Amino acid sequence: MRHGKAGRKLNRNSSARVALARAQATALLREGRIQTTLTKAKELRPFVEQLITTAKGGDLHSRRLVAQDIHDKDVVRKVMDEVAPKYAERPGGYTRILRVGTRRGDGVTMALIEL
Amino acid sequence: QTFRNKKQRKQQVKLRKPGFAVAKYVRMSPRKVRLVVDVIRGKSVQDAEDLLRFIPRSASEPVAKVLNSAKANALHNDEMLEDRLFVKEAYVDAGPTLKRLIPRARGSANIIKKRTSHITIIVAEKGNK
Amino acid sequence: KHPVPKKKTSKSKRDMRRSHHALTAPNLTECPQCHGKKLSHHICPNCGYYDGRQVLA
Amino acid sequence: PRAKTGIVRRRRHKKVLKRAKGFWGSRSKQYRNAFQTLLNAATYEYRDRRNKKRDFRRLWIQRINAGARLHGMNYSTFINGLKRANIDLNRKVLADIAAREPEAFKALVDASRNARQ
RNA sequence: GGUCAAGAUAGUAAGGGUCCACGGUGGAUGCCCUGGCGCUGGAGCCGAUGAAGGACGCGAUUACCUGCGAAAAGCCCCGACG
RNA sequence: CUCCCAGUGACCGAUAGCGCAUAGUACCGUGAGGGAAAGGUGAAAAGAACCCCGGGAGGGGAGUGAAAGAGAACCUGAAACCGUGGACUUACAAGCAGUCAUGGCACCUUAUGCGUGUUAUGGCGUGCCUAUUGAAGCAUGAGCCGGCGACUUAGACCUGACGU
RNA sequence: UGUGUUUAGGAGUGAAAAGCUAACCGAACCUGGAGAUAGCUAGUUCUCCCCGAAAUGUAUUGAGGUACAGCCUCGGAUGUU
RNA sequence: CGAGAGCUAACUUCCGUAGCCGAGAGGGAAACAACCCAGACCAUCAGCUAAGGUCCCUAAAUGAUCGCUCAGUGGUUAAGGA
RNA sequence: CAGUCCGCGGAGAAGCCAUACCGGAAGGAGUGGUGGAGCCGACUGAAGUGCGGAUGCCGGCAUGAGUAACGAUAAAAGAAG
Ligand SMILES: [Mg+2]
Ligand SMILES: [Mg+2]
Ligand SMILES: [Mg+2]
Ligand SMILES: [Mg+2]
Ligand SMILES: [Mg+2]
Ligand SMILES: [Mg+2]
Ligand SMILES: [Mg+2]
Ligand SMILES: [Mg+2]
Ligand SMILES: [Mg+2]
Ligand SMILES: [Mg+2]
Ligand SMILES: [Mg+2]
Ligand SMILES: [Mg+2]
Ligand SMILES: [Mg+2]
Ligand SMILES: [Mg+2]
Ligand SMILES: [Mg+2]
Ligand SMILES: [Mg+2]
Ligand SMILES: [Mg+2]
Ligand SMILES: [Mg+2]
Ligand SMILES: [Mg+2]
Ligand SMILES: [Mg+2]
Ligand SMILES: [Mg+2]
Ligand SMILES: [Mg+2]
Ligand SMILES: [Mg+2]
Ligand SMILES: [Mg+2]
Ligand SMILES: [Mg+2]
Ligand SMILES: [Mg+2]
Ligand SMILES: [Mg+2]
Ligand SMILES: [Mg+2]
Ligand SMILES: [Mg+2]
Ligand SMILES: [Mg+2]
Ligand SMILES: [Mg+2]
Ligand SMILES: [Mg+2]
Ligand SMILES: [Mg+2]
Ligand SMILES: [Mg+2]
Ligand SMILES: [Mg+2]
Ligand SMILES: [Mg+2]
Ligand SMILES: [Mg+2]
Ligand SMILES: [Mg+2]
Ligand SMILES: [Mg+2]
Ligand SMILES: [Mg+2]
Ligand SMILES: [Mg+2]
Ligand SMILES: [Mg+2]
Ligand SMILES: [Mg+2]
Ligand SMILES: [Mg+2]
Ligand SMILES: [Mg+2]
Ligand SMILES: [Mg+2]
Ligand SMILES: [Mg+2]
Ligand SMILES: [Mg+2]
Ligand SMILES: [Mg+2]
Ligand SMILES: [Mg+2]
Ligand SMILES: [Mg+2]
Ligand SMILES: [Mg+2]
Ligand SMILES: [Mg+2]
Ligand SMILES: [Mg+2]
Ligand SMILES: [Mg+2]
Ligand SMILES: [Mg+2]
Ligand SMILES: [Mg+2]
Ligand SMILES: [Mg+2]
Ligand SMILES: [Mg+2]
Ligand SMILES: [Mg+2]
Ligand SMILES: [Mg+2]
Ligand SMILES: [Mg+2]
Ligand SMILES: [Mg+2]
Ligand SMILES: [Mg+2]
Ligand SMILES: [Mg+2]
Ligand SMILES: [Mg+2]
Ligand SMILES: [Mg+2]
């Protein structure tokens, strides 16, 4: 049972759970919005919010702590110098989800995630 | 108010099928298709237009197109008023069946039924009542 | 091993089994900022407004 | 000359299926089981036609002793008193119809009881 | 008629059943024949001047069948039809 | 004798009839070899211009036609089997599915009745065949409907009944 | 281990299991004899009328099968046996 | 019923004999080929009975008279005791 | 199926479909509805002549059932067309 545990596998192992979180982070930071399945978007939101608050420190340590999860340099500069200083005033809550509705192939209910 | 024989009735009364549309040979299980076709049935043809559009089944596509043709020949051919139209009738019967061989373990085959579908819908004016 | 069903299942009991496969019609509701219908807690597919316009199309 | 079965068989079949039309399940629609259910149906038919007299005789007697005891006699004593006078030779069914007309039934009860004294 | 008591008693269908009506399926049934079977009776050998059976190929366009063969859906002489 | 030709038939007529209404093809086999389903617009193509919904496919109109209750998935179109609609019904019921009886509802084209459909309750009631001393059997066979499917022919024979 | 090649049906091959011989080898496969034989099993369909048994005796490479009696039926005669 | 074989076992096996069942429906024996009654041509919402029954289920005397058993014997044996 | 009669039929045959009628049964009629081109009745003759069964054959359609699975656990994600 999970009478307190937290998270989701997304039908994958540990390193896969991990790269998926890191790479959809990289994408919605690269592009400000992406559309993806509703589950995986609820997954992504706490990850990427933690990460933007990591980048809100300014420092070389904060940028290296982000560099570990986001290994395309240009996004690291965006999130660090462009986006986290933008959210300066925000006490947390740097993302939203609205749900675009259902896909045809697999009948998933996809949604949008933006900032 | 009736003719001599059926040979004359065939010539003078030509028998039309108002509100009627049918989509033959739809490559789909009927069993699946009736699942939505029940939802539509008896309802306002605009609610059919909307219901059919969010129910999340592959079978909703062909049952959509037919519904339009029903309303189409309800309006172009039959002089009916579209603010009356509604789904007086809807049903799907089974068409023919593609049979295919499928290999299975230890050298036996089986036969597999790709059922087709004859969807059919008949709209009519909500002038009843 | 290898359980099988015994007697062929009758039309009537089959239908009582399928008694629960009734589909649930979506609770549709019309977009305040447009014509058409939209699923609740989703954006209007036709217009794209969730409050301003949200999706592109 | 060939002479295929053809139209014969299906005439016979439809006759059976037409006898079997109240019946449940394939006792109504397949021939084989239709004909089979009709086998036991024939048995039960021929039984009941002469058992139904048993049941109705029961119902007559059962209704007669009711008025018998209603007056303070009973079936055994009451028919023994309607026999003890020779002149009563009506069937039990007519004693029932009289049990539906209380005045005449009581007249026969006093007649019978004036014959076992 | 209002409240309380005791008692009796409907209707509802998720889905079902019997019957009726309208279809879908499927290709039985009748009818037909473009195809067979048998008997009777005819006729009865081909081949080294190349058989039987084939393989390529021939057509404005030709995958299959026919017919035909680099003179190749064919060439010449006679007769018939018109 | 009959590869082949004609004629004929108390011969078949699409599961029949040759395996083939054509094909020794498809397909199966390394091979020798095995080996299928078969069909039907209509008189004539007049084989549906044009319009409508749909990428289609399919369909509705219009026309052609005697018939489109023939439209190329084109004669009829039975049964299983799948549905749509309407009558009567069904959620304290124990049940070889029926049988007779009584009541309730519906209906009236061999039909206002010694009625048809349905139904509630009461009584009654051990599928079928086979093989058996003995079958509801927990003995065999069988998913269901269709259709193929078994006491024949022969002979200068023997024997009996009947008839000429 | 490749290629090519030779050896086969009571025959081949076998460092021997009756193993292998084109995915069922104490005798392959195909075509045929051929509709082998089957005292063994199962199956044998339209209706009504009349009559109605046997599971006994003896014989048998016989005992779950046959022959002859015994019992059934149809007709003729006899004529109360 | 009469024997053998058996253990005076067997829904045992083998003979004699009668009846039923096989080939037999109908009432009784809760149920039940064999037991007890009784051999179904057909139809009736008619009558007398057989076996078996008459408190309710469940048709039909809570019948009558002299007792018997107070054990639920009735509704599962014996040697033996009281 | 055949011979011979009697006939019927595009104002419509067989076949198919309902049906409360009729004979003692196998069965057969009446009326209605499809169908669209052959066919009933009587007498006789010949048969490949009557199906529920054969783990029968050819065929179609059910039940299991919207069930098991979708063929290696080398994952996939965003944009844009
Ligand atoms: Mg998964
Ligand atoms: Mg923090
Ligand atoms: Mg006209
Ligand atoms: Mg087909
Ligand atoms: Mg197991
Ligand atoms: Mg009975
Ligand atoms: Mg109260
Ligand atoms: Mg039909
Ligand atoms: Mg011919
Ligand atoms: Mg040559
Ligand atoms: Mg050329
Ligand atoms: Mg030359
Ligand atoms: Mg000429
Ligand atoms: Mg053939
Ligand atoms: Mg056929
Ligand atoms: Mg052949
Ligand atoms: Mg080939
Ligand atoms: Mg089409
Ligand atoms: Mg048509
Ligand atoms: Mg037609
Ligand atoms: Mg066509
Ligand atoms: Mg024709
Ligand atoms: Mg047709
Ligand atoms: Mg109740
Ligand atoms: Mg129950
Ligand atoms: Mg019985
Ligand atoms: Mg035995
Ligand atoms: Mg059994
Ligand atoms: Mg079995
Ligand atoms: Mg001789
Ligand atoms: Mg003589
Ligand atoms: Mg050999
Ligand atoms: Mg040797
Ligand atoms: Mg081998
Ligand atoms: Mg021989
Ligand atoms: Mg013997
Ligand atoms: Mg003898
Ligand atoms: Mg004598
Ligand atoms: Mg002894
Ligand atoms: Mg014994
Ligand atoms: Mg014995
Ligand atoms: Mg016997
Ligand atoms: Mg007897
Ligand atoms: Mg008896
Ligand atoms: Mg007893
Ligand atoms: Mg009893
Ligand atoms: Mg018995
Ligand atoms: Mg018996
Ligand atoms: Mg016994
Ligand atoms: Mg006695
Ligand atoms: Mg009596
Ligand atoms: Mg007595
Ligand atoms: Mg009583
Ligand atoms: Mg004692
Ligand atoms: Mg007519
Ligand atoms: Mg008839
Ligand atoms: Mg014609
Ligand atoms: Mg004919
Ligand atoms: Mg035969
Ligand atoms: Mg049989
Ligand atoms: Mg069968
Ligand atoms: Mg089969
Ligand atoms: Mg499951
Ligand atoms: Mg699964
Ligand atoms: Mg697997
Ligand atoms: Mg991609
Ligand atoms: Mg982008």
From Swiss-Prot, chain A:
What are the protein's UniProt keywords? Ribonucleoprotein, Ribosomal protein, RNA-binding, rRNA-binding
Q: Which residues cross the membrane?
A: none
Molecular functions (GO terms) = rRNA binding; structural constituent of ribosome
Under the heading InterPro entries, the entry gives: Ribosomal_bL17, Ribosomal_bL17_CS, Ribosomal_bL17_sf
GO CC annotations, alphabetized:
cytosolic large ribosomal subunit
Among Pfam families, the record links this protein to: Ribosomal_L17
GO terms under biological process: translation
Its biological purpose is as follows:
Binds to the 23S rRNA.
**UniProt cross-references to HAMAP family, sorted A to Z:** Ribosomal_bL17
PANTHER family reported for this sequence:
LARGE RIBOSOMAL SUBUNIT PROTEIN BL17M, RIBOSOMAL PROTEIN L17
Q: Which family does it belong to?
A: Belongs to the bacterial ribosomal protein bL17 family.
Q: Subunit comment for this entry? A: Part of the 50S ribosomal subunit. Contacts proteins L3 and L32.
Indicate what this protein is called per its UniProt record. Large ribosomal subunit protein bL17
Gene name for this UniProt entry: rplQ
UniProtKB/Swiss-Prot annotation, chain B:
The UniProt entry's GO CC annotations, sorted and at most eight, read: cytosolic large ribosomal subunit
For this chain, one GO molecular function annotation is: rRNA binding
Q: Does the keyword Ribonucleoprotein apply?
A: yes
Among the Pfam families in the record, one is Ribosomal_L22
The membrane-spanning stretches of this chain are none
Keywords, sorted A to Z: Ribonucleoprotein, Ribosomal protein, RNA-binding, rRNA-binding
What biological-process GO terms show up in the record? Answer: translation
Q: What does this protein do?
A: This protein binds specifically to 23S rRNA; its binding is stimulated by other ribosomal proteins, e.g. L4, L17, and L20. It is important during the early stages of 50S assembly. It makes multiple contacts with different domains of the 23S rRNA in the assembled 50S subunit and ribosome.
Q: How does it assemble?
A: Part of the 50S ribosomal subunit. Contacts protein L32.
Which NCBIfam families does the entry mention? rplV_bact (TIGR01044)
**Family designation:** Belongs to the universal ribosomal protein uL22 family.
| Name of this chain's protein | Large ribosomal subunit protein uL22
Give the lineage: Bacteria, Thermotogati, Deinococcota, Deinococci, Deinococcales
Curated annotation (Swiss-Prot), chain C:
**What protein name does the entry list?**
Large ribosomal subunit protein bL32
In Gene Ontology terms, what is a biological process of this protein? translation
The record's section on InterPro entries has: Ribosomal_bL32, Ribosomal_bL32_bact, Ribosomal_zn-bd
What do we know about how this protein assembles, alone or with others? Part of the 50S ribosomal subunit. Contacts proteins L17 and L22.
Free-text function comment from the UniProt entry: Forms a cluster with L17 and L22, and with L22, a pair of 'tweezers' that hold together all the domains of the 23S rRNA. Interacts with the antibiotic troleandomycin which blocks the peptide exit tunnel.
- Keyword Hydrolase listed? The answer is no
Positions of the UniProt region annotated as Disordered: 1-32
Fetch the NCBIfam families from UniProt: rpmF_bact (TIGR01031)
Single Gene Ontology MF annotation: zinc ion binding
Which keywords appear in this protein's UniProt record, sorted alphabetically? Metal-binding, Ribonucleoprotein, Ribosomal protein, RNA-binding, rRNA-binding, Zinc, Zinc-finger
Q: How is the cofactor bound?
A: Binds 1 zinc ion per subunit.
Residues in C4-type zinc fingers run 31-47
Quick check: keyword Zinc in the entry? yes
Q: Where does Zn(2+) bind?
A: C31, C34, C44, C47
Per the UniProt record, the source organism is Deinococcus radiodurans (strain ATCC 13939 / DSM 20539 / JCM 16871 / CCUG 27074 / LMG 4051 / NBRC 15346 / NCIMB 9279 / VKM B-1422 / R1)
Cofactors (names): Zn(2+)
Write out the biased-composition intervals (Basic residues): 1-21
Similarity comment: Belongs to the bacterial ribosomal protein bL32 family.
Could you state one GO cellular component term attached to this entry? large ribosomal subunit
**What Gene3D superfamilies does this protein map onto?**
Single helix bin
UniProtKB/Swiss-Prot annotation, chain D:
Q: Which keywords does the record carry?
A: Ribonucleoprotein, Ribosomal protein, RNA-binding, rRNA-binding
Q: What is this protein called?
A: Large ribosomal subunit protein bL20
Q: What does this protein do?
A: Binds directly to 23S rRNA, probably serving to organize its structure.
Where does it sit, as one GO cellular component term?
cytosolic large ribosomal subunit
Classification via InterPro entries: Ribosomal_bL20, RIBOSOMAL_L20_CS, Ribosomal_protein_bL20_C
Coiled coil spans:
none
Report which superkingdom the organism of origin falls in: Bacteria
- Similarity field: Belongs to the bacterial ribosomal protein bL20 family.
UniProt xrefs under HAMAP family: Ribosomal_bL20 (MF_00382)
What Pfam families does the record point to?
Ribosomal_L20
What is the organism of origin for this protein? Deinococcus radiodurans (strain ATCC 13939 / DSM 20539 / JCM 16871 / CCUG 27074 / LMG 4051 / NBRC 15346 / NCIMB 9279 / VKM B-1422 / R1)
**Single Gene Ontology BP term?**
ribosomal large subunit assembly
According to the record's subunit comment, the protein's assembly and interactions are:
Part of the 50S ribosomal subunit. Contacts proteins L13 and L21.
GO molecular function (one): structural constituent of ribosome
